[PDB]
Ligand binder design. Structure first.
Ligand SMILES: NC(=O)c1ccc[n+]([C@@H]2O[C@H](COP(=O)([O-])OP(=O)(O)OC[C@H]3O[C@@H](n4cnc5c(N)ncnc54)[C@H](O)[C@@H]3O)[C@@H](O)[C@H]2O)c1
Ligand SMILES: NC(=O)c1ccc[n+]([C@@H]2O[C@H](COP(=O)([O-])OP(=O)(O)OC[C@H]3O[C@@H](n4cnc5c(N)ncnc54)[C@H](O)[C@@H]3O)[C@@H](O)[C@H]2O)c1
Ligand SMILES: O=C(O)[C@H]1O[C@H](OP(=O)(O)OP(=O)(O)OC[C@H]2O[C@@H](n3ccc(=O)[nH]c3=O)[C@H](O)[C@@H]2O)[C@H](O)[C@@H](O)[C@@H]1O
Ligand SMILES: O=C(O)[C@H]1O[C@H](OP(=O)(O)OP(=O)(O)OC[C@H]2O[C@@H](n3ccc(=O)[nH]c3=O)[C@H](O)[C@@H]2O)[C@H](O)[C@@H](O)[C@@H]1O
Lengths: 314, 314
């Protein structure tokens, strides 16, 4: 088929394109405006290989300015990953690009998909929509975001449901849980903490470090994401959690990084940042059932992979 | 005490201001940018009756072009009604004004209220957030909007929760159910059908006319809205349905209108329009407990009042 990947030069999008291109029967169109928290230099690195592949077409344009008629011509599947993704930087004057790139972009894509015959529109969303929840969260749980970011991503999900129900756009929603590994964005905790540790600079901890995440290794995330395309079973209209092998606190992670480096971290404990939950924890039963999803990369292996990537990057 | 009412020149806002001005204790500031579906001619008359009262101050400005710090210094309570409200006109290129005036306006007001000492931030929302549900809907039900309009309004609610949890802004959310009576917007069903019936023209019905609403008479809406200010109970953080005395389908309303006009209407059944639920039905248990809310205006009395107003307007 022809598969459109929005946000193709980003962390997850770059990996997803590479995975799809291993199947000789797939042709990939990647669109990326090179905005958000990752510098354009890192994004060029993410796609340099991809651009050599003859079955990849790269478009460096804003989805809000591009000819969406041309873009979606003969597209069989859309993977919509384009977004402004930072939890902590979505307040005051920094909110507008979240609304433009998370809400207006999703709506304009969904409008463009009304007059074409997609197999699937695979919309990427976030554990950030759940907000502050206790236990493993299931996809039927009432979402109450804690960040303006989370609000804009949940508005994107609701636009998906509006366009599915009214115009039969074949939407599938994936909710990722804190994805890490090679090419992780430089605003995320593991990139920052590894870069700090490499430079013998203080590790920046927001609050006391006891907060936990369901960290998902990139290869696990991509296996789940590709499974959503490749299943022959009806998952249209479904919201599916994609979570990781092993939860950990930021203190637990730092201890694991010290074992990889053989260094001892200097720690700087900052104020908690408004808008962050203290815990995330996916119930991935539905992904297990629908996609045969099971994450297999341990934090020790995934963290070594990221540490190696960050060291070579800088 | 001093009360800011956004969207003060609008249908519900103008009636709200009118009700608050009856209390000589209350100083009222109205702000309205004269946008949305109602032509500015009808809104002028709204602010003209309000401006007879010395305790009313009117600001004719976009909330996005206002010094909100300056405005809010002496404000005790905000009623936030300003929005783009039409369910049916929120598709395609019409969507952006809903994002601007429903999402960016709400965010920017909440940002300005972060360091104000408010008693209450009373955010007006809509039954449109629920989408299609069976039975009387309670406020803890998972909302799945059917329209882009509904998505933008539920995004505003989510912003209220974010700013409440992170910054202790004392938000209360009211979900209104299809409000009618004198001053009803010309794009709403009762206004169009009464105008049509008055001029012996076909009554335009969008589908089979079996659609029903929990229609709320304006005076009932306003009594519940004023109760949110005056209640003895703690309602900070609550979502509260404000629904009407009697549910009806459009066919029923057309029969009730024939009784009032003494006319037999010609019907013009048109294609159902995307993004509209078939039923709305409020569980008003919570309003009854927290606000002593009981709607008291019957459809026959309310339609008569709206009939007399439409007759007078044209
Ligand atoms: N990284 C995670 O932990 C994680 C977890 C949950 C969900 N998500 C979601 O996964 C997706 C990918 O996240 P990521 O970490 O790869 O982020 P990223 O910033 O690395 O990638 C997103 C890409 O979208 C592009 N983009 C944004 N707006 C655009 C526009 N208007 N037109 C064209 N391109 C545009 C950016 O240039 C960027 O390269 C996002 O939707 C994010 O919300 C990520
Ligand atoms: N009418 C109903 O049946 C109903 C039911 C549910 C909820 N609501 C909600 O009630 C509120 C009032 O609805 P209404 O029927 O009175 O609508 P309306 O259009 O009569 O009034 C809203 C007013 O907001 C003003 N406004 C919009 N954007 C603005 C901005 N940026 N700055 C300043 N003013 C701005 C408009 O000029 C308009 O006069 C809305 O929030 C709507 O979503 C209405
Ligand atoms: O799962 C998700 O939906 C979200 O996951 C991540 O968001 P976040 O959980 O903030 O991921 P990190 O940035 O890796 O933060 C993880 C934890 O580390 C903490 N942190 C972060 C950065 C840092 O320098 N120090 C620090 O202690 C944060 O407080 C947080 O508790 C992504 O950045 C989002 O794009 C995505 O939506
Ligand atoms: O309750 C709500 O939350 C919403 O109520 C109304 O929206 P709507 O329910 O569309 O109200 P009307 O415009 O009065 O429409 C009611 C019904 O009449 C129908 N209709 C409308 C107009 C018309 O000419 N003919 C007709 O049959 C519609 O299809 C709908 O089923 C308001 O317009 C919204 O601002 C508000 O958000």
């Amino acid at each position: 088929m022809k598969i459109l990947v929005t946000g193709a030069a980003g962390f997850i999008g770059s990996h997803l394109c590479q995975a799809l291109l291993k199947n000789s029967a797939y042709h990939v169109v990647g669109i990326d405006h090179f905005i958000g928290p990752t510098p354009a230099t890192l994004k060029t690195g993410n796609i340099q290989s991809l651009e050599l592949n003859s079955r990849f077409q790269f478009i460096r344009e804003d989805i809000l300015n591009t000819d969406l008629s041309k873009l979606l011509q003969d597209i069989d599947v859309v993977y919509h990953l384009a977004a402004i993704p930072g939890v902590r930087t979505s307040w005051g004057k920094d909110f507008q690009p979240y609304v433009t790139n998370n809400i207006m972009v999703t709506q304009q894509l969904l409008e463009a998909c009304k007059h074409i015959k997609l197999d699937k529109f695979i919309h990427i969303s976030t554990s950030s929509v759940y907000g502050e929840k206790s236990g493993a969260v299931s996809e039927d749980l009432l979402p109450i975001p804690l960040s303006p970011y989370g609000v804009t991503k949940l508005s994107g999900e609701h636009l998906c449901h509006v366009y599915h129900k009214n115009f039969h756009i074949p939407i599938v929603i994936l909710r990722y849980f804190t994805v890490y590994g090679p090419r992780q964005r430089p605003d995320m905790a593991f990139h920052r903490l590894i870069k700090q540790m490499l430079e013998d600079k203080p590790l920046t901890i927001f609050g006391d470090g006891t907060q936990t995440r369901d960290f998902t290794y990139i290869d696990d995330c991509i296996r789940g994401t590709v499974a959503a395309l490749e299943t022959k079973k009806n998952i249209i209209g479904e919201v599916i959690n994609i979570g990781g092998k092993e939860q950990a606190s930021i203190l637990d992670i730092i201890s694991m990084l010290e074992k990889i480096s053989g260094k001892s971290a200097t720690k700087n404990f900052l104020k908690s940042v408004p808008g962050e939950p203290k815990q995330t924890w996916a119930d991935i039963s539905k992904a297990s059932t629908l996609l045969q999803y099971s994450p297999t990369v341990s934090l020790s292996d995934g963290l070594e992979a990221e540490y190696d990537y960050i060291k070579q990057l800088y």
